Ligand code: HEM
């Protein structure tokens with residue numbers, strides 16, 4: 222089974238497009254799903270090898286039951302709202318995700334235009350974010366973002382469904398959340414205080430040693446081990462976005478994993494906390510305004526519709 226391009230090389234541009242399927246739009250969506258790989262080749266090929274254009278298509282739980290009959294991916298459910306004592310992870314509507322990445326925005330935009338042209342009158346846009354790589358892989362908080370992502374075989378094993386759900390092997394689960402940052406509040410902190418929020422040095426990106434890394438730092442709370450002692454990993458490709466006029470400075474979070482259980486465990490630790498941590502300190506400067514969960518099927522599943 223051939224996975225979608227979940228494990229993309231590093232790209233500096235992205236479009237995240239989240240849509241709902243209007244009543245009666247199911248047939249139009251099915252036809253487009255069977256063509257998206259063709260469209261990705263048509264738009265991207267003339268910019269190879271440096272274009273690196275890819276589209277990962279995800280289908281939400283409710284949408285799956287409208288589009289398909291028979292067996293479902295084992296972990297496919299609607300995003301689970303988290304009502305923490307301070308912070309809330311909201312669930313927002315989303316039937317289809319198109320995670321479009323490239324070395325240039327122009328390739329992303331052209332593929333988004335071709336996809337949305339085919340879906341006109343069948344879908345309603347819910348979210349559209351144009352993301353950009355910010356200096357040396359930094360996010361809007363000024364920290365390097367992606368450092369401890371798994372690579373190679375480790376990444377394949379973390380993100381791709383295998384024999385635990387054999388009918389859907391080569392798929393993945395994507396969790397998206399659009400975050401807005403309170404940059405005025407963040408910039409009121411010293412660099413040393415910001416490093417205690419994230420759990421790494423700001424300029425050099427060296428992890429704080431275990432003796433000084435706070436229990437409520439981002440890195441501490443999103444570090445999770447399984448019962449068998451192994452690290453539970455996700456693959457992230459967070460993208461900055463914003464609008465200076467509106468004072469909107471955001472991180473578009475996207476995390477891929479073999480099972481939503483790994484991503485949801487991290488979210489629970491962030492929003493509801495643990496024994497030693499009320500919540501992830503990153504949320505004191507970051508508000509989630511969307512939250513959706515998608516299954517990204519194997520490429521051959523989409524081709525065969
Ligand atoms: C709120 C906006 C977010 C920002 C700005 C952000 C930023 C960062 C930064 C700067 C790092 C350290 C460098 C790195 O390894 O990437 C990091 C690590 C991480 N983040 Fe986030 N993050 C956010 C949300 C989330 C969410 C929602 C999750 C999970 C559901 C998550 C999971 C992780 C994980 C697993 C790591 C690696 C921890 C480790 O193993 O060392 N992040 N993030």
Ligand SMILES: [Mg+2]
Pocket residue numbers: 403404405406468
């Ligand atoms: Mg402000």
